[PDB]
Symmetry: C2
């Protein structure tokens, strides 16, 4: 059971870009065939969809990630991170509770597939019911 940094630098860049509000930096970390596995949702393929997804998030939420742990990996083609999402609910996300600038804080995690240093798959996990409880009410 050997572990190393693998392609973790890409994962670091990705999250750093997120915290900077830099979608361009995030997109730069992704392969053209990127499969985004939406929590409690569907699988969205490609950068056009990803950019749209980011825009949507940018409208609804203002967030910063803290307590970031990017795990050592047994395989350069895989990665994992656990962290804390801190945010403000700026504008109502369709189907979710009404936004009134609620403050929230939630544990989260992400798993990835990589190919040659680019993320080919991203799966983000968090407890949606927990979040809903915080913003409802």
């Amino acid at each position: 059971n050997l572990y190393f940094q693998g392609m973790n630098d890409t994962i670091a860049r990705y999250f750093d870009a997120f915290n900077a509000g830099d979608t361009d930096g995030m997109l730069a970390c992704l392969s053209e065939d990127v499969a985004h596995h939406v929590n409690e949702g569907n699988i969205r393929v490609g950068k056009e969809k990803f950019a749209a997804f980011c825009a949507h998030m940018s409208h609804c939420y203002k967030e910063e990630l803290t307590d970031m742990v990017i795990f050592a990996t047994p395989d350069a083609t895989r990665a994992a991170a656990e962290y804390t999402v801190n945010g403000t609910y700026l504008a109502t996300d369709e189907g979710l509770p009404e936004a009134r600038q609620q403050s929230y804080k939630l544990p989260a995690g992400s798993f990835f597939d990589l190919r040659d240093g680019l993320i080919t798959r991203v799966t983000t996990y968090y407890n949606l019911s927990d979040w809903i409880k915080q913003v409802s009410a």
Copy 2:
């Protein structure tokens, strides 16, 4: 880029025990103060609760985990695992759909804290909406 070896394979033992249906083996991987995060509002602490929880699972589901990838930190105090859950829904779990021996397959992920080689925290995520869709079919 250097490597390290995680010699104490507590996480692997834990999942191996799970697969073998050996709750004793799972319990042995945990600290007396283990915090089982079902959700924010519901953190079950200790081995008595965990054993009851396994009995509950044992009643409702039969599952095997495959495609296991385990991640670590150099200090050995944090870990993550991504895998595939393959099961049969044996008996109804309160608030979930009716059990009819439906088969299901879905990805899942777990995050752990460890101290002195024992699991002190366990959190597991998966696409619940997807699961519900699968068993409702």
